[PDB]
Design a protein around this ligand. Structure first.
Ligand SMILES: *[C@@H]1O[C@H](CO)[C@@H](O)[C@H](O)[C@H]1NC(C)=O
Lengths: 396, 49
């Protein structure tokens, strides 16, 4: 059961007469679905991603400044000028400088001065944005039958099934092996706000940073840096990384305002990360809405022999899961497929079985089946698996 | 001469290509592709099963 691997979980319960359950599935959540006379199911939103989402605006984090050129004129001669002022990839400022005799100039007054600095971006100091397309984004929903098999989070359940929901994907049927069929219809517009969302990406090779951040579209367009679109040759607003020092005769002081990477990372502290599996850009938060069809699921092995009540041992003793459920695993020593004789008793009242199983009709197979999950009332209880027993105290 | 037609009516229908689909008491609604198609008449009902 995948939803034991997570400390966020939900439990959904249908009666014997149920069909088409409606869910919100969230990234890093998981839902266990239960219905009377049906096998229970773990259903989760595995991922939301796109292959190669469209590059939007690039920003420059650190300017590389060069070719500072100055021209200046005496107070009568009007504007000083440079061809730079008209070239691509330059920053310029025009100002008034005090002039006089000995400033190698005819008259005491203010002379026009112009300075221009050539201003490319520093190597690998780009913050690129990407935008999702509702016509190419994939939601992934995963399902597993809630069998008596325990498999770790670094391991895969053989009954695990996967459905991709693109916009071109209609109501999809997954054959849960011997457990029948489940059907899913997840509406890709009944999910994340893809217009409001940018995947912000820096250097992918940065060993001590996130691969990307999930950032708001308006905030990204409000980043106060030089910027350009994909394939554009030169930075808009290159001024934002250059300061000019107050004019001195025939000088105005070009200052590179330094690397703004740490300014960005402070404004990205605690912000949701996004993973980048090569070409796949993954959200790590967000959700989808689905209808799940239970109406073609089957109970496995309801016609199997009850197991020999003597032949059980624990593999894993009754344990609190943190979800108010108790989990355990048993071995069985007959060479058989059989129904596990599981029950639990409120201590001192042996007649009323109080085991609400989460694994319905628990069964041991020729390989697999020993794991059981159940819910119990507060106070002292005894769990039984035939002749095995374990006194269990239930909190709250 | 040849006054403008209004509505045609049919006095005698012709029925062909009848199809039935049924589903057991909790497997949800039975369906046919013919419930979408033009020129079909359909009924949806409950059967004691
Ligand atoms: C999962 O991790 C455990 C502990 O390191 C290891 O024994 C087991 O083989 C791993 N399973 C897989 C399939 O990687």
């Amino acid at each position: 059961s995948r939803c034991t691997h997570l400390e966020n979980r939900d439990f959904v319960t249908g009666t014997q007469g149920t069909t088409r359950v409606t869910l919100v599935l969230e990234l890093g959540g998981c839902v266990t679905i239960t219905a009377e006379g049906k096998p229970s199911m773990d259903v989760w939103l595995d991922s939301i991603y796109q292959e190669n989402p469209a590059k939007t605006r690039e920003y420059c984090l650190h300017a590389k400044l060069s070719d500072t050129k100055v021209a200046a004129r005496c107070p009568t001669m009007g504007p000083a000028t440079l061809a730079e002022e008209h070239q691509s990839g330059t920053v310029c400022k025009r100002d008034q400088s005090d002039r006089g005799w000995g400033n190698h100039c005819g008259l005491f007054g203010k002379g026009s001065i112009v300075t221009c600095v050539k201003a490319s971006c520093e190597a690998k100091k780009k913050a690129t944005g990407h935008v999702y397309d509702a016509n190419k984004i994939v939601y992934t929903v995963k399902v597993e039958p809630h069998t008596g098999d325990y498999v770790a989070a670094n391991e895969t359940h053989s009954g695990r099934k996967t459905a991709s929901f693109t916009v071109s994907s209609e109501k999809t049927i997954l054959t849960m092996g011997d457990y029948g069929d489940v059907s899913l219809l997840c509406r890709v517009a009944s999910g994340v706000d893809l217009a409001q969302t940018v995947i912000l990406e820096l250097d992918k090779t940065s060993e001590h940073l996130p691969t990307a951040w999930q950032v708001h579209r308006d905030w990204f367009n409000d980043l106060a840096l030089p910027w350009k679109h994909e394939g554009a040759q030169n930075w808009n607003n290159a001024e934002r990384l250059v300061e000019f020092g107050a004019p001195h005769a025939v000088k105005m002081d070009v200052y590179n305002l330094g690397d703004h990477t740490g300014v960005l990372l402070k404004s990205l502290a605690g912000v949701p990360v996004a993973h980048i599996d090569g070409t796949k850009y993954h959200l790590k938060s967000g959700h989808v809405t689905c209808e799940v069809g239970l109406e073609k699921l089957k109970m496995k092995g309801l016609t199997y022999t009850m197991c020999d009540k003597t032949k059980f041992t624990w593999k894993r003793i009754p344990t609190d899961s943190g979800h108010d459920t108790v989990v355990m695993e048993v071995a069985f020593s007959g060479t058989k497929p059989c129904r596990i004789p599981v029950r639990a008793v409120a201590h001192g009242s042996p007649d009323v079985n109080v085991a609400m199983l989460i694994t319905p009709n628990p069964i041991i197979e020729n390989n697999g089946g020993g794991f059981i999950e159940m819910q119990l009332p507060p106070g002292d209880n005894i769990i039984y698996v035939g002749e095995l027993s374990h006194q269990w105290f239930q909190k709250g």
